[PDB]
Design a binder for this molecule. Structure first.
Ligand SMILES: N[C@@H](CCC(=O)N[C@@H](CSC[C@@H](O)c1ccccc1)C(=O)NCC(=O)O)C(=O)O
Ligand SMILES: N[C@@H](CCC(=O)N[C@@H](CSC[C@@H](O)c1ccccc1)C(=O)NCC(=O)O)C(=O)O
Lengths: 217, 217
């Protein structure tokens, strides 16, 4: 089978779910539910973490036949290669590698904030820096429909998740960046993406786990 | 020649310097130096961060003619592709992606600890977890000379850095894992690596920046 294992939240699995849907993959999900405060029990996961044959047990994981893959970027690249959704030219591969890692840094900046006990005090600093962050992505995208040019590739699924999560956080944040606004709309307008988003499989919320200060519900 | 820009420390540039040396690359280093405590003045970098033509200005960066690259993994992959130092088969590419990301997680775990003011109280937790972490890498390597099999590739440069840095931190940590010990020796014994390491250009210390509680010198 093809099985995606992750917590029952958006988190690091959003881009993977969207890519599985876009590629018309035949997959099922193993959803782990963290317990409520105060214990935030992880037993649903911990009771099988070491029983799945994973080399480096973690969430998310993808099982595809005999392939057992962890690390969200490795999972995305695996699916992308399977469906010819990677950068082709050297210049495209450079952009792909820069963006995969840059978007991960941006993702981690937001996650660090949203789990920080000092969230309320720290949020203004994040918001002050947000337009500059977005400006750099806007400049890089330029006039192209997708981040690697005319063809959609896996890094667009990363880009969508990170950019759209920032819109959930600060609704107006993309408004100053026409190309980013149009990118979100173009992605959500893709046939398989809009089909997914009208279905009960779509899991836009909670953004983060039960322990988060923001995005826990 | 190419320009490699980074702080005047080991940090995220160790694997890149080693890969540049292994590939006989012509390069010069632009070395930045941080100020002292408590402010850790970054002016030497910040005063030219936006004057270098980088799309997402950061350290490390690599300038190779028209190619201007940030994100350490992107720099490594760029050099690796140029010299056929990447996984070839699907299984090799999956291993490569898992390890690139897994080693980054390990790297960040040690850096998070060593930069934490509460270093002393937090150290036992890291050290107790270390054997498990290394066991997983040892199991994955098995009897192979290199992490992707019989061919050395860029992920070996990442592996060497992360494993050897842990040996600096905890001198005995690889002793229980003969294949990891032997891997370190094999990497260090490559002609071009050995020549570099025995030269004055090799920069094993400081491990981290001036802000670190451990490895700041
Ligand atoms: N670099 C890895 C990070 C993987 C990771 O941090 N995984 C977290 C859940 S997501 C990170 C974050 O969204 C999250 C969600 C829910 C709980 C904790 C953290 C996890 O629960 N791993 C299993 C384990 O440690 O046993 C990756 O990209 O896959
Ligand atoms: N994901 C990125 C991380 C890049 C990064 O965190 N770079 C740090 C110095 S290294 C991280 C670490 O070794 C370090 C070194 C020195 C000081 C603090 C931290 C930096 O100083 N960037 C310049 C900037 O943000 O303007 C990468 O892999 O290249």
């Amino acid at each position: 089978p093809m099985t995606l294992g992750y917590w029952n939240i958006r988190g690091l699995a959003h881009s993977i779910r969207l890519l599985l849907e876009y590629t018309d993959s035949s997959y099922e999900e193993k959803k782990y539910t963290m317990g409520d405060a105060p214990d935030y029990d992880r037993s649903q996961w911990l009771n099988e973490k070491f029983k799945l044959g994973l080399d480096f047990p973690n969430l998310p994981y993808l099982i595809d036949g005999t392939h057992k893959i962890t690390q969200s970027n490795a999972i995305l690249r695996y699916i992308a290669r399977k469906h010819n959704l990677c950068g082709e030219s050297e210049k495209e591969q450079i952009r792909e590698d820069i963006l995969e890692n840059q978007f991960m840094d941006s993702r981690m900046q937001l996650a660090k904030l949203c789990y920080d006990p000092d969230f309320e005090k720290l949020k203004p600093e994040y918001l002050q820096a947000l337009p500059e962050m977005l400006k750099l992505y806007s400049q890089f995208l330029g006039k192209q429909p997708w981040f690697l040019g005319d063809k959609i590739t896996f890094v667009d699924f990363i880009a969508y998740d990170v950019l759209e999560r920032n819109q959930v956080f600060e609704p107006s944040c993309l408004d100053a960046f026409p190309n980013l606004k149009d990118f979100i709309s173009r992605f959500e307008g893709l046939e398989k993406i809009s089909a997914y988003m009208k279905s009960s499989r779509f899991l836009p919320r909670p953004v983060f786990s039960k322990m988060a200060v923001w995005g826990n519900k």
